[PDB]
Amino acid sequence: KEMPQPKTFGELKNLPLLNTDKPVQALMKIADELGEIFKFEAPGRVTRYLSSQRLIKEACDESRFDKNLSQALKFVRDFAGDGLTTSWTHEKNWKKAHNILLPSFSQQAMKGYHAMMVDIAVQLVQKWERLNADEHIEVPEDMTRLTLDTIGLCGFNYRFNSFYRDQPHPFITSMVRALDEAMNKLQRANPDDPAYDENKRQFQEDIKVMNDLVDKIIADRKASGEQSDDLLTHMLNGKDPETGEPLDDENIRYQIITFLVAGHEVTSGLLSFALYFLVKNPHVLQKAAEEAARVLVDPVPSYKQVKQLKYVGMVLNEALRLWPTAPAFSLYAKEDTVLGGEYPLEKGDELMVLIPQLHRDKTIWGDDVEEFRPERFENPSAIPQHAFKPFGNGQRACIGQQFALHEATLVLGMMLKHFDFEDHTNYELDIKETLTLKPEGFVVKAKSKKIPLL
Ligand code: HEM
Ligand SMILES: O=C(CCCCCn1ccnc1)N[C@@H](Cc1ccccc1)C(=O)O
Secondary structure (H helix, E strand, O other): OOOOOOOOOHHHOOHHHHOOOOHHHHHHHHHHHHOOEEEEEEOOEEEEEEOOHHHHHHHOOOOOEEEEOOHHHHHHHHHHOOOHHHOOOOOHHHHHHHHHHHHHOOHHHHHHHHHHHHHHHHHHHHHHHOOOOOOOEEHHHHHHHHHHHHHHHHHHOOOOOHHHOOOOOHHHHHHHHHHHHHHHHHOOOOOOOHHHHHHHHHHHHHHHHHHHHHHHHHHHHHHHOOOOOOHHHHHHHOOOOOOOOOOOHHHHHHHHHHHHHHHHHHHHHHHHHHHHHHHHOHHHHHHHHHHHHHHOOOOOOOHHHHHOOHHHHHHHHHHHHHOOOOOEEEEEEOOOEEEOOOEEEOOOOEEEEEHHHHOOOHHHHOOOOOOOOHHHHOOHHHOOOOOOOOOOOHHHOOOOHHHHHHHHHHHHHHHHHHEEEEOOOOOOOOEEEOOOEEEOOOEEEEEEOOOOOO
């Protein structure tokens, strides 16, 4: 089969289609038009966007395909270095860091982080308890305060104190601006044009800011000798069972930057979308609120109670189905192979997995794919293989999946226990795209149920 291709712009091929405010949603519309696979060409680049479970289940075969760094990840590597997400699988630092960090990210390690996650979750609840009657909540803004603070505390015992300020932390200003520059280079038809020279100068200054601030955090911890149960201690003390080597200080810095990128808007996007879908689906909200009240019987949730918030876990998975906040990942063929029995690929050929479109495959989910129905996730054995991939695939899957879902389940549970919510503006969904997705301008009113935290 010859695969389709969207409209072209002469020598720029398909590249101008990405010069738009919402490229992921633009790619989803192209997929709707062209189907489960289409070719996408730019100067010096060819990739193929996959959207059906039929083809993606083959792409997830790790004997045939390995993780590729998309152009986006290549630009993020300019400041995330060989941290886990921007490393190639064959780089020595990928497997070393993966072996060392896996026990820090397990379901068992979440027991150790739980107290710190509660610390920040309680600050969010108290903020909302303290609003006056006429005020509202800026949802993505507050969810990002929560997730940033949680990863700072669990990551290296650092308090960003986001609920005490309007103006972001200096590290975050550079990190957000670096991510902004990474996404902007994707959309430049002529990136060598001198009008981008201070953009490039600014990008180099932001890299130096992040590096110096994180390096000081590491030097300060080594100097004090204190042993906290955070990711920094584990990286300073851990040894890779295979090579027997610890991480070096440069790589630890890259891992910290990587966790901070991941724990910022990618996780807060999930909480924002989940609350959006709950207020748009009051019957689902009521069921989740009933579970929260039945399970969260103590003033602050325990680790074990968060594990019992099963329906809230389903709400979060259904929010990830519709708007996965890391919406794509890239693969390359390790050898010549045939995809779906119709599309021959040569060694090195690249694939993009378009996750939001995969998650709308009507042959998997039925006709009602656009509806928010957490009950789809009652039994993971009833979901076909590779139909649901919001955390990536295989050995390159998200190491932070348990962390993100524990944090999100805890805080959504507390939110549902402590407040009734009003969609007071009848908010129209507007998905702002960076390298992640979020519902821009989403606002609600939260009326306290006046249940104490003591
Ligand atoms: C809802 C929240 C999150 C989602 C949807 C998400 C999604 C993803 C996805 C799709 C990948 C694979 C990327 C690729 O194949 O190119 C990935 C990898 C990764 N994520 Fe997450 N993530 C989330 C939260 C987090 C958190 C909270 C952390 C750490 C604190 C984290 C750390 C990582 C790392 C280190 C990798 C690379 C793992 C490796 O390649 O060995 N993520 N994530
Ligand atoms: O399709 C995408 C969407 C974004 C994927 C990477 C962003 N993200 C998501 C989760 N974690 C990182 N990105 C391609 C775009 C592109 C295609 C062809 C030529 C140039 C650019 C890429 O970045 O290579």
